Structure formats: C-alpha cells, structure tokens
Amino acid sequence: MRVVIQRVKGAILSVRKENLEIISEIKNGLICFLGIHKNDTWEDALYIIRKCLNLRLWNNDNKTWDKNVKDLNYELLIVSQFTLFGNTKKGNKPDFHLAKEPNEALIFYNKIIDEFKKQYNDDKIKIGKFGNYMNIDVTNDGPVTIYIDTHDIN
Amino acid sequence: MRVVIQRVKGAILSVRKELEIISEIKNGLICFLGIHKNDTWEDALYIIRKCLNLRLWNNDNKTWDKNVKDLNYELLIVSQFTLFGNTKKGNKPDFHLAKEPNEALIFYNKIIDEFKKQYNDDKIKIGKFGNYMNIDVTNDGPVTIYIDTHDINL
Ligand SMILES: Nc1ncnc2c1ncn2[C@@H]1O[C@H](CO)[C@@H](NC(=O)[C@H](N)Cc2ccc(O)cc2)[C@H]1O
Ligand SMILES: Nc1ncnc2c1ncn2[C@@H]1O[C@H](CO)[C@@H](NC(=O)[C@H](N)Cc2ccc(O)cc2)[C@H]1O
C-alpha cells in the first residue's frame, strides 16, 4: 500500500453531476491519497491507518513535530488514488499494472474507511468518490508531504 | 532524489510578509522535490526528464496521452525535505537523509535552471526555499505520481 499524506488548512472535494458539486469538505487536517497494491493484505492497511492517525505532523508549545491528528481533533480526507502505482520506469506513458482491480479495491477501500472511523471517529473521516473524476481545492499548510510504501517495513 | 508530482488546474503560492502571493500557475504540475544528501546531477536529470515527459493528461478519447510540454502547461517546483521524513522508527519523522540546506539550495537552484533550459524560462515557477509556504491548489483528477531515483539504475 502507498500513501501520500499532505497537511492542510482545508480541502473541498467535488465531482461531476453530469450523467461540479461539493460532496465533501474538511478544515485543518490531512489529505491522504491512498493506493491499494494488488497484493495488499489487512496488515498493510493497518500500518497505514496507524501512521496517518499517529504521525506527529504539527508543532505544539514551541516544540516541533509534536502532535498527531487525533490530539488536535483534526480531520482526515481519504482519497483513492491508483496513480501511485503508475510505473514511470519505462517511457512516457505510465502503466498501472501493480494496482488492485477496481472491484476488489473498492471493498478493500471501504473496509479501510470503516477501520479508520473505528480507531478515531465517524465524523472526523471524510472520503471522496471511488472511481469518479474529482476536483479538490486544497490549502496546503507548510507544505508538509509524507510518502509511505508498505512494501518497505515489517 | 524524491518527487511527488500532482496534476493541477491552478496553484497560488503565498508566504508570510499577512500572506503575500509570490507565485502562480494555472494548468500544470506541482512538483514537491526532496534532495538526498548523496544525489548527483544524474538523479536530477532523471527527475527533470520525467516531470517534463510523462503523459499525464488525456486527449479526447485517448488516455494518459499528453505531457506538460505537449500542452504548453506550467510547472511549480516546490522544495520539500519532508519526503526524507523517515517514519519507520517512531511517530516523529527524522530528516537525516535530506541534504543540508545551503548545499540543497545551490543544487535546487541548478535544478530550476536546467528545467528552464529543457523547457521554457517562462513556464517554470518556484516557491521560496527554506520558508513557510501556503499553497492554494486545485487538484485535477486527482493525479499523484511518486518517483524515488534510488529505486532505479541510472
Ligand atoms: N488500486 C486502487 N487503489 C486506490 N484506488 C483505486 C484503485 N483502483 C481503482 N481505484 C479507484 O478507481 C479510480 C479509477 O480507476 C481511481 N481514481 C483515481 O486514481 C483518480 N480519480 C484519477 C484518475 C485519472 C484518470 C482516470 O482515467 C481515472 C482516474 C480510484 O478512485
Ligand atoms: N534537502 C532538501 N531538499 C529540499 N528542500 C530542502 C532541503 N533542505 C532544506 N530544504 C528547504 O528548506 C526548508 C527547511 O529545511 C524546507 N521546507 C519544507 O520542506 C516545507 N516548508 C515544510 C516545513 C514546514 C515547517 C518546518 O519547520 C520545516 C519544513 C525546504 O523548502
């Protein structure tokens, strides 16, 4: 599993209504762009969940890297992104072969979302719209960008 | 050397003087660039070639088909040491892998110069290295790409 975590003052997420309208909004918090690998297991997901929730990305009391999202009662917007498995190693056109197929990915993603809300709180976890074109107006704070690939630890 | 490339409709970059705008792009890419203490010129040339050549926009009916240069779009290069934020140990990132600020700035300035030489002086915008930045961004897709050059054989 791969995640890019960005620290924000706000994020406004919107989709097409045409078959843009705002479907989700956060203030202070994190936006987490999350890629599900075809071989991901529950263990991968748990590690990402723990890290997003516990990473000390805010300053407190004139001390750096001190507080996490839960501490400050901040929000998280979770956005599904298969582009992180974009192989850029060959030429100009990225391929996305490492990504989990969208049907499996969706149920996996929903499970992750539920697990997020379980360790924190239902009101503090916002999502986008798996499989849909999205527009996200984001106020980047710092900016602070953290990358994690689970294929590198335990 | 590490980079997070995001596809944008626009990005407005602001620093504390309260917030003065120093830099603005419409359509293009924002690149969050982290320089590693052992990075060579070759690592840079690989990132530059990729930000410039990767086919990240669709083109009516065709998917992942056009790059930033094809479309005559812009690039906002933003210096980011948080990409060397190691989060494997505790929950406080450490940044020992990141090249020291003055050497980093010198290297970053060269990188900007080579971007301009490979594309166009007018099309490459930057942040304020070493400074707190606020970045109002409109993510388009979203599309997020991560590259680490120590994962490939130059
Ligand atoms: N493996 C996956 N991990 C995370 N999200 C996934 C994965 N597979 C599918 N998705 C979801 O399905 C969408 C389109 O396939 C994924 N969407 C995206 O990555 C962005 N909306 C960008 C995008 C850009 C172009 C395009 O043709 C499709 C999507 C994600 O919401
Ligand atoms: N090795 C480096 N690679 C890229 N940028 C670097 C590097 N070293 C220093 N910088 C620049 O100097 C700042 C502090 O080191 C870096 N700033 C940032 O990464 C963002 N403003 C995030 C931030 C936010 C707060 C803070 O106290 C430090 C950093 C970067 O612009």
Measured over the CA atoms of residue B142, residue B143, residue B147 and residue B152, the dihedral's sign is: positive
Q: What is the resolution of this structure in A?
A: 2.2
Token pair 């890297």 is found at A65
Residue that the structure tokens 């304020």 belong to: B128
Nearest CA among A119, A122, A114, A146 for reference residue A32:
A146
Q: Which CATH architecture has domain A1-154?
A: 3-Layer(bba) Sandwich (3.50)
Contact status of B66 with chain A (Cβ, < 8 Å):
no
Distance from the Cα of B76 to chain A's closest Cα (Å) equals 13
**Half-sphere CA count of B123, side-chain side, radius 13 A:** 20
Q: Do B91 and A68 touch (CB under 8 A)?
A: yes
CB nearest to A147's CB, from B53, B54, B83: B83
Give the Cα-Cα-Cα angle B97, B102, B120 (nearest 5 degrees).
95
Q: How far is B93 from chain A (nearest CA, A)?
A: 7
Distance (Å) from CA A47 to ligand 2 centroid? 26
Q: Chain A contacts of B88, Cβ < 8 Å?
A: 152-153
Residue A17 sits at φ, ψ, to 5 deg, of -100, 5
Q: How far apart are CA A3 and CA A80, in angstroms?
A: 9
Q: Decide if B82 is catalytic.
A: yes
**Which residue of the set A83, A88, A145, A150 is catalytic?**
A83
B83 lines ligand 2 (CB under 6 A): no
Q: Distance (Å, rounded) from C-alpha A98 to C-alpha B19?
A: 42
Residues of A in contact with B132 (CB under 8 A): 142
Q: How far is CA A39 from CA A47, A89, A99, B82, B145, in A?
A: 15, 20, 9, 27, 20
Report the C-alpha gap between A35 and A58 in whole angstroms. 24
Contact A4/B4, CB-based, under 8 Å?
yes
Answer whether B50 touches A (CB < 8 Å).
yes
> Which phi and psi (to 5°) does residue B127 adopt?
-90, -170
Question: How far is C-alpha A93 from the chain's CA centre?
Answer: 24
Q: Which atom of ligand 2 is nearest to the CA of B98?
A: 1
| Assigned token pair, B141 | 């897709």
User: Which of A81, A94, A143 is opposite residue B142, by nearest beta carbon?
Assistant: A81
Q: Where are the domains of chain A?
A: 1-154
CB contact under 8 A, B133 and A144: no
Q: Is B55 helix (H, G, I), strand (E, B) or coil?
A: coil
